[PDB]
Scaffold this motif. Structure first.
Motif, short mmCIF file in Angstrom:
data_model
loop_
_atom_site.label_atom_id
_atom_site.label_comp_id
_atom_site.label_asym_id
_atom_site.label_seq_id
_atom_site.Cartn_x
_atom_site.Cartn_y
_atom_site.Cartn_z
N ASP A 5 67.55 22.03 60.75
CA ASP A 5 66.16 22.12 60.33
C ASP A 5 65.22 21.62 61.43
O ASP A 5 64.16 22.22 61.66
CB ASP A 5 65.94 21.32 59.04
CG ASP A 5 66.80 21.82 57.90
OD1 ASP A 5 67.55 22.80 58.10
OD2 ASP A 5 66.71 21.25 56.79
N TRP A 6 65.59 20.53 62.11
CA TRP A 6 64.75 20.01 63.17
C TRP A 6 64.66 20.98 64.35
O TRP A 6 63.59 21.15 64.94
CB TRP A 6 65.27 18.65 63.64
CG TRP A 6 64.50 18.07 64.79
CD1 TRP A 6 64.89 18.04 66.09
CD2 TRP A 6 63.21 17.46 64.74
NE1 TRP A 6 63.92 17.43 66.86
CE2 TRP A 6 62.88 17.07 66.05
CE3 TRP A 6 62.30 17.20 63.71
CZ2 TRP A 6 61.68 16.43 66.36
CZ3 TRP A 6 61.11 16.56 64.02
CH2 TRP A 6 60.81 16.19 65.33
N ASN A 7 65.78 21.62 64.70
CA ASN A 7 65.79 22.57 65.80
C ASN A 7 65.09 23.88 65.46
O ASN A 7 64.82 24.67 66.37
CB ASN A 7 67.22 22.85 66.24
CG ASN A 7 67.91 21.63 66.80
OD1 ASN A 7 68.98 21.23 66.33
ND2 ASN A 7 67.31 21.02 67.82
N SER A 8 64.79 24.12 64.18
CA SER A 8 64.11 25.34 63.76
C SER A 8 62.59 25.24 63.86
O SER A 8 61.90 26.22 63.56
CB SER A 8 64.51 25.69 62.32
OG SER A 8 64.22 24.63 61.44
N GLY A 9 62.06 24.10 64.28
CA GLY A 9 60.63 23.95 64.43
C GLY A 9 59.86 23.87 63.14
O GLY A 9 58.69 24.27 63.10
N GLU A 10 60.48 23.38 62.07
CA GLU A 10 59.78 23.24 60.80
C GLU A 10 58.71 22.16 60.89
O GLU A 10 58.86 21.16 61.59
CB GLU A 10 60.77 22.90 59.68
CG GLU A 10 61.78 24.00 59.39
CD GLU A 10 62.74 23.64 58.28
OE1 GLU A 10 62.62 22.52 57.73
OE2 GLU A 10 63.62 24.46 57.95
N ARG A 11 57.62 22.37 60.16
CA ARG A 11 56.50 21.45 60.15
C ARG A 11 56.71 20.40 59.06
O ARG A 11 56.85 20.74 57.88
CB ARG A 11 55.18 22.20 59.92
CG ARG A 11 54.82 23.17 61.03
CD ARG A 11 54.56 22.44 62.34
NE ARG A 11 54.18 23.36 63.40
CZ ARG A 11 53.85 22.99 64.63
NH1 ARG A 11 53.84 21.71 64.99
NH2 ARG A 11 53.52 23.91 65.53
N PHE A 12 56.74 19.13 59.46
CA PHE A 12 56.90 18.01 58.54
C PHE A 12 55.63 17.17 58.56
O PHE A 12 55.07 16.89 59.63
CB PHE A 12 58.11 17.15 58.92
CG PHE A 12 59.42 17.88 58.83
CD1 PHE A 12 59.59 18.93 57.94
CD2 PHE A 12 60.49 17.51 59.63
CE1 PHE A 12 60.79 19.61 57.86
CE2 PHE A 12 61.69 18.18 59.55
CZ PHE A 12 61.85 19.23 58.67
N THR A 13 55.18 16.76 57.37
CA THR A 13 53.95 15.99 57.22
C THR A 13 54.23 14.73 56.43
O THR A 13 54.82 14.79 55.34
CB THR A 13 52.86 16.82 56.53
OG1 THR A 13 53.34 17.28 55.26
CG2 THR A 13 52.47 18.02 57.38
N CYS A 14 53.81 13.59 56.97
CA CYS A 14 53.91 12.31 56.28
C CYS A 14 52.52 11.92 55.78
O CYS A 14 51.58 11.82 56.57
CB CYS A 14 54.47 11.23 57.20
SG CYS A 14 53.96 9.54 56.79
N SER A 30 56.71 17.53 64.60
CA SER A 30 57.50 18.74 64.79
C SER A 30 57.95 18.83 66.24
O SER A 30 57.23 18.41 67.15
CB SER A 30 56.71 20.00 64.40
OG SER A 30 57.49 21.17 64.59
N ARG A 31 59.14 19.38 66.44
CA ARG A 31 59.68 19.55 67.78
C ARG A 31 59.02 20.76 68.45
O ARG A 31 59.08 21.86 67.89
CB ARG A 31 61.19 19.73 67.74
CG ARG A 31 61.84 19.89 69.10
CD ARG A 31 63.34 20.06 68.99
NE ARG A 31 63.98 20.20 70.29
CZ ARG A 31 64.18 21.35 70.91
NH1 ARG A 31 63.80 22.50 70.37
NH2 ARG A 31 64.77 21.36 72.10
N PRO A 32 58.40 20.60 69.61
CA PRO A 32 57.75 21.75 70.27
C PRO A 32 58.75 22.75 70.81
O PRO A 32 59.46 22.47 71.79
CB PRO A 32 56.93 21.10 71.39
CG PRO A 32 57.65 19.82 71.68
CD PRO A 32 58.21 19.35 70.37
N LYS A 33 58.82 23.93 70.19
CA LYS A 33 59.72 24.97 70.64
C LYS A 33 59.14 25.70 71.85
O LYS A 33 57.94 25.64 72.13
CB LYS A 33 60.00 25.96 69.51
CG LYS A 33 60.65 25.34 68.29
CD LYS A 33 60.93 26.38 67.22
CE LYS A 33 61.87 27.46 67.73
NZ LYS A 33 62.16 28.49 66.69
N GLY A 34 60.01 26.41 72.56
CA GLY A 34 59.61 27.17 73.73
C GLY A 34 59.63 26.41 75.03
O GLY A 34 59.07 26.89 76.02
#
Lengths: 55, 97, 106
Positions: A5-14, A30-34
């Protein structure tokens, strides 16, 4: 969370629920992809001869 | 036949769980229904209605149990008053926000 | 059968709780619950000045130790509220005085 899930670039909000602040702040993590991958280079710098004088 | 006045009270800014009071005054006839809403959703429990008293005018009050965390999270609470086929909605929010 | 200190709670109108012809007016609610015995005295104070008019106190009604509740309503003016006036509800129970201070300041 899952590793995939983390490697898929999903947006998480706290969201914070605090009594003092009437407005719950939103923080996005979120992990910046690209981004490309590079091999790190490790270099060790020995101390200079001008530093080993005061002992 | 006069439309009932709708007023919603809020907890003090500097702190107090707490209760929400919705008051309908100067209404006729005596029968009247008062309900509560939470973010546009029907409330099924946690609210009580006191018997109507005589202040000819009448007064009816309602009590809704709320938590400190939920109230201060900018949740929308609406008091619904039905009288003579008319529906009145009053929305409140945090003043210090 | 029991002696418990009364709890003092004060309700204030919101920013949009004023209506009617200018000047607008609202109400303040001070309620004491879970107190014993039945007798209780409720008074309203405005910036240290006793309020002798514009208030109506509802009769004490019954809500295992016996419990009672009391509701008091005081009419206030919008102009006074905007001047950062502090309203204090005075509760007397068995010779004990409990005061609660509320204000529009955040």
């Amino acid at each position: 969370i899952c590793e995939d899930d983390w490697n898929s670039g999903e947006r998480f909000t706290c969201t914070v629920t605090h009594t003092d602040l009437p407005s719950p702040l939103k923080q996005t993590i979120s992990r910046p992809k690209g981004v490309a991958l590079h091999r790190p280079d490790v270099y060790l710098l020995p101390p200079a001869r001008e530093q080993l004088n005061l002992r | 036949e006069m439309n009932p006045n709708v007023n919603v009270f809020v907890p003090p800014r500097d702190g107090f769980k707490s209760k929400l009071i919705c008051e309908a005054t100067n209404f006729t006839p005596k029968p009247i229904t008062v309900s509560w809403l939470k973010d546009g959703k029907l409330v099924e429990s946690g609210f009580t209605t006191d018997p109507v008293t005589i202040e000819q005018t009448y007064k009816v009050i309602s009590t809704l149990t709320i938590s400190e965390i939920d109230w201060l999270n900018l949740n929308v609470y609406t008091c619904r008053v039905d009288h003579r086929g008319l529906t009145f909605l009053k929305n409140v929010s945090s003043t210090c926000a």
